Amino acid sequence: EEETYRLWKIRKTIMQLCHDRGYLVTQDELDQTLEEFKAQSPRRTDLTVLVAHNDDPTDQMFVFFPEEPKVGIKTIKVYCQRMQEENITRALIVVQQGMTPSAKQSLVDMAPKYILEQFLQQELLINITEHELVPEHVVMTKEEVTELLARYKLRENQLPRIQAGDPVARYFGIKRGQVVKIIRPSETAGRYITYRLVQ
């Protein structure tokens, strides 16, 4: 019954990850304890969640928990079919051992039609975003980046870079070309604000 503890931690972390992306999540899911998780729900196909977005109610996300410890191209297709038929665009695949290396470039191959993304199970046992040293990241909107570049007379290159595989760019699901504001809690100035272009 440690499998259940792992399932509960991963589900709580994914609920927090979905709330930080701006999806409609209730307080109970974010404050759900183990005794009630196991009360509700055992399997790995009824842990799949489907969440809606604050705006764009059609824009929803779908979280998978594949059974195969090493997901492959066929496993990816089997529920890319589910997504294509239910009419969703985004997904999130929590894998237990990894993805066979061809799969990673397949997930990338699926054009903005159906954009997927993978997360290891050991990466979700804790919320890195809740570490002391990790600042708060905020994906800037297309109209705030323009005002930033205009205030500092900048170009989008010539800005600090954040890797597209950064453990906190993968969590906040930030695509390439997006600028993220970062609020460092500084011992010197309190709440220093920086900006990083995702690339």
Binding site: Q105, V108, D109, A111, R155, E156, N157, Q158, R161, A164, R176, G177, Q199
Partner: protein
Amino acid sequence: VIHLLLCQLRVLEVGALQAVYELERILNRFIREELEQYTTEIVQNNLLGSQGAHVKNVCESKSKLIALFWKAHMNAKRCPHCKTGRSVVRKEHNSKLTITF
């Protein structure tokens, strides 16, 4: 690889830095006509940036691209069009290059 790198260089010359990964993904999802349309669209809509291309983060990308090319794609290989075109140049100490039969 030849055409991908050609287009990536064409876009780097003007500074466009997202075009690099965009071209690579356009390729993998798919050759010259597929890539040259996007690359010309970039180089046209993003010109006026030949003076704003001599910045760090634009030199690192070109450095990495050309280094990876010279490091991974210039090894002796059986020839594509004629299967027996490995006239193995193999250079001894400087001032010496030896082709075989």
